[PDB]
């Protein structure tokens, strides 16, 4: 588990709408983890589609769709070791009624289908989901002047 | 389903120590509604009517005067699993056993005075309710963000 | 003298309930060293609030005024503490946000003077006559902070 | 004054590596204006003398680019009544020794070449330097959900 | 019981990231007391001296030269269960194992960059205690607030 | 030059009894300022009364000293460029009625005999209370991992 390893997060029209893009951010940006690309979008229904497409037939998969393209959304990668897990737990539980205070969910979301953010689920899929939603040009390279008092190798 | 409702307390310790503001955005960042709030130093047989399942306790005289020893900001919360999720903001009844991140965890230590009270149950808080509040102090409104905060019900 | 039981009348106005700024508001007026000695979530007539604004009756923006007071619950509040009225003016910013600073609830919050998310009484006199207006008596809480002798060297 | 004015903010690379993206982007966020367009960006130099195109003759000109080459940059479009103006006043004044505290300067920056930020300091400028910064394309259009409860006029 | 204390330091990391004051007000904000506090670069033989319990286990060397790498704000809080509690606040010695809402869990990834130290024990405090501060730099007081944070002393 | 200024800032007891340790550290931190000594001490009284000399015929000294007796102090040297001056802008106007919001008085303070902090006022003042509270060996010299994107020359 090296300190380049890379996640996809993404704030979710709700999380747009409802004011929350500073405090995601800072969450993640607080906890030591590295911004590689960000841009706000509304992606065309294809991609949402792909991004989503093991849950193609799921029933709230029509659903979730329409509302992915409801409003912009924050599409980001961040750099850092073990970022995917940790991401995940930043984020809280996908449903947040099971979320803890202290976690983006559990401090801001309510229901599954509103839950204001994505995070990749594992390093392949994340990798996946940064090919598709960005160019490999928009991933900026740069290393954060606090490297060396966040990690101790690596 | 979102329009559950649930009873939360602010006691006299977390009014003293300045903690109205951040335990209402708690619930306000979380996305439930406020549909009645006040400041009150209620009646004694009102604060032992909320408390009537422990009159028989040791400490019942010692909590209802310490609940009697400052003022109490009262709320009514509404939204989806309010009850449930109000409890798990507050954190566990003792603070020793509360989490960083909830109420509790962050400003509590002692479990009589752990700063908030909220409703156990959707029956209880029906009560609690009733008892804390009269019906026109419930305040109906529509969150202008209530469907971005909830996909149905 | 100023003394430190002067009061104010502070109210959360329904865009300021509506966007979420009620707990912010009230750590502004909290972190301090002011006193919270009434409050309540209410949805007053428009009689109330008409009295409330008497003074501006004749104004051109007086019809949508009180028509968007009347849009949402209104969080109602008096404050307890040395200048709190001149202080509290202070805290909200100017009237209008185009003109507040930065760091007041208006430079950090609101953008239209129509849209401005809170109220405070301008005068002494005219905070009893809104705290009467607003709340019975015995809705205003008498008690003492614990951290009285150290916000204030003096009553 | 209309409520769609827009102006460009960008948080320099300093702004980037001592972790202000969250807090200033929360800045705006909470005043009320809109996130009509955002990236992380590193711009090539010809952009960066572009967008400082009035400071090329400047001793301290090459020097300034060459500290915006240094790292990525943050670049949003912001829009709200008087965004401009108010933005610049959210910032607070260029030379941070000069700023009030609660603006941006004034809670996070000492030097006025590491002054964090950037905001168009005109109607006309920020129009010049949303075309420089980002294709028509990458402005979001979106009505925020409380749009009507930020203000009272279109 | 309510007069139980621990050692709190942060490390070089902490302060280097500008961690200091998000901190102190974790702990301030719960409502112990601080009765001791410095910054302090502290001679090598002192921080063998505290990490000796895993003087020849690995990471020694390189945790020394870490702790000797930077400043540290070494304090001491006070309060009921504070060693138990404290070590919660800081979260699990792994940041990766923490969770959000503790101070690890919001600030660190690394362990050999876990931000912070806490006494595991009320014994290992006294002696940290001891170790870091002399008897004088303990300073007494009473909190205005002590009896809204404690039912009991 | 003048990077290296330093100024005396103490949380007064008030400040310490209201739990205001934090946040007040965290308007110097987030400036971009550097600590390089801090202590909580309880001085005795003719420390006081010579820290407020120049204040022994006006007639709120006595009950100053007294105050400043009453509860512990957090005392604290802070290094960067204008310090002093910037300090002194941090903390607000002397009597917090005359504050404006966003400073520390500001925020938290009413009366000007408890006005929870003290900064010194100017540079040679700053030199003559540092000698006054703290030793020599108890100022840390060390070099802030982002001190190249706090200032751009020393
Ligand atoms: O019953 C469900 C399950 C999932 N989702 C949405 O579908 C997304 C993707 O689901 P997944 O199982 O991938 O969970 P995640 O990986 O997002 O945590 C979630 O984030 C939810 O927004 C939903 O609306 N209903
Ligand atoms: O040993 C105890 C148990 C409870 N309480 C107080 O009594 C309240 C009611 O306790 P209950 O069992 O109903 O738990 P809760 O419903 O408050 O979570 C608690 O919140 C505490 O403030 C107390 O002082 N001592
Ligand atoms: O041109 C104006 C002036 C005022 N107002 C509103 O009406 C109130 C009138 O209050 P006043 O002029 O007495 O000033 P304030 O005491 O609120 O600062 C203001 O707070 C605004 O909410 C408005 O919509 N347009
Ligand atoms: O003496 C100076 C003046 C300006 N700048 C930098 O150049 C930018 C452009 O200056 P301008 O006059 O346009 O001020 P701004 O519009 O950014 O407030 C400033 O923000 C600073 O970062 C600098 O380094 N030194
Ligand atoms: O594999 C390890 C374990 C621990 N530590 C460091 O050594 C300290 C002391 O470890 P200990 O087992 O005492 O855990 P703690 O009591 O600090 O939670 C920890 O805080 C870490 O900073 C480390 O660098 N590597
Ligand atoms: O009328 C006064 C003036 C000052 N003070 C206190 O004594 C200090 C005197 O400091 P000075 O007048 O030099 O101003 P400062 O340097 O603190 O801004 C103030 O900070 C206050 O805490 C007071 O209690 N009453
Ligand atoms: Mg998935
Ligand atoms: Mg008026």
Same mark, same amino acid.
């Given at each position: !588990?090296?300190?380049?390893?890379?996640?996809?997060?993404?704030?979710?029209?709700? =999380? +747009?709408?409802?004011?929350? @893009? #500073?405090?995601? @951010?800072?969450?993640?940006?607080?906890?030591? %983890?590295?911004?590689?690309?960000?841009?706000?979008?509304?992606?065309?229904?294809?991609?949402?589609?792909?991004?989503?497409?093991?849950?193609?037939?799921?029933? %709230?998969?029509? #659903?979730? +769709?329409?509302?992915?393209?409801? =409003?912009?959304?924050?599409?980001?990668?961040?750099? =850092?070791?073990?970022?995917?897990?940790?991401?995940?737990? @930043?984020? #809280?539980?996908? *449903?947040?009624?099971?979320? /803890?205070? =202290?976690?983006?969910?559990?401090? %801001? /979301? @309510?229901?599954?289908?509103? *839950? +204001?953010?994505? #995070?990749?689920?594992? +390093?392949? *899929? &994340?990798?996946?989901?940064?090919?598709?939603?960005?160019?490999?040009?928009?991933?900026?390279?740069?290393? !954060? &002047?606090? %490297?060396?008092?966040?990690?101790?190798? /690596?």
């Amino acid at each position: !588990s090296m300190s380049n390893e890379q996640t996809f997060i993404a704030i979710k029209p709700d =999380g +747009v709408q409802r004011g929350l @893009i #500073g405090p995601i @951010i800072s969450r993640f940006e607080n906890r030591g %983890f590295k911004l590689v690309a960000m841009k706000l979008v509304s992606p065309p229904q294809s991609q949402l589609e792909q991004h989503y497409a093991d849950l193609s037939d799921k029933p %709230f998969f029509k #659903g979730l +769709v329409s509302y992915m393209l409801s =409003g912009p959304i924050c599409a980001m990668v961040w750099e =850092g070791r073990d970022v995917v897990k940790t991401g995940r737990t @930043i984020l #809280g539980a996908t *449903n947040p009624l099971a979320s /803890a205070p =202290g976690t983006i969910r559990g401090d %801001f /979301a @309510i229901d599954v289908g509103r *839950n +204001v953010c994505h #995070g990749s689920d594992s +390093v392949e *899929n &994340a990798k996946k989901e940064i090919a598709l939603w960005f160019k490999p040009e928009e991933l900026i390279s740069w290393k !954060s &002047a606090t %490297f060396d008092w966040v990690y101790e190798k /690596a």
